[PDB]
Amino acid sequence: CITEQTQYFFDNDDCGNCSRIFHVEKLMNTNLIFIPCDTRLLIQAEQTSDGPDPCDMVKQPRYRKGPDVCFD
């Protein structure tokens, strides 16, 4: 704590870095590591989206005989 205060000054002078792991004991544990220890898990959801998805294949959907079998 106070040692983490001296560490806080050490940060002012190293590398606080959140690093999620989705693995571990089931839960999505976050991991700070500096260049203090594994804790629980949280957060994502996001607002801005990214990482382009793709497909560009098949996607058959056009038809010429959708039988009105319906149900029943």
Partner 1 sequence: XXXXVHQLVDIYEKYQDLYTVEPNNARQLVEIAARDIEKLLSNRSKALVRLALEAEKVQAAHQWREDFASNEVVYYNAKDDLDPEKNDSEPGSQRSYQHAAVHIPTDIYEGSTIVLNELNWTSALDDVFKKNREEDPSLLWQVFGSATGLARYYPASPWNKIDLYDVRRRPWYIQGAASPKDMLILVDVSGSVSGLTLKLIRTSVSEMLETLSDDDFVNVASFNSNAQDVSCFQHLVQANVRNKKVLKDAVNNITAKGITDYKKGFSFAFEQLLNYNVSRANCNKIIMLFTDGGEERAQEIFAKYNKDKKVRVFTFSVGQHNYDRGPIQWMACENKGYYYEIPSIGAIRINTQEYLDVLGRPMVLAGDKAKQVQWTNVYLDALELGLVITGTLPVFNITGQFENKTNLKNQLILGVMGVDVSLEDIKRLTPRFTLCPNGYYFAIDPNGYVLLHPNLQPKPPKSQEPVTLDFLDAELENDIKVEIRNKMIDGESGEKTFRTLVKSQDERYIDKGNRTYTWTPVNGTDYSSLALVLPTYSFYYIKAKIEETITQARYSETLKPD
Give the binding site for partner 1 (CB under 8 A). Answer: 15, 17, 19-20, 22-23, 26-28, 31, 33-35, 40-42, 44-45, 49-55, 58-66, 68, 70-71
Question: DSSP character for 68?
Answer: T
- Does residue 31 interact with ligand NAG by CB under 6 A? no
Q: Which is nearer to ligand NAG, 58 or 62 (CB)?
A: 58
Give CA–CA dist 67/64, Å, rounded: 9
11 binds, among ligand NAG, partner 1, none (CB under 5 to 8 A by kind): ligand NAG
Q: Which two tokens stand for residue 44?
A: 């994502």
Task: Give rounded-to-5 percent helix, strand, coil for the chain.
Answer: 15, 0, 85
State the binding partner of 30 from ligand NAG, partner 1, none, CB within 5 to 8 A by kind. none
Please give the structure tokens belonging to residue 61: 């959907």
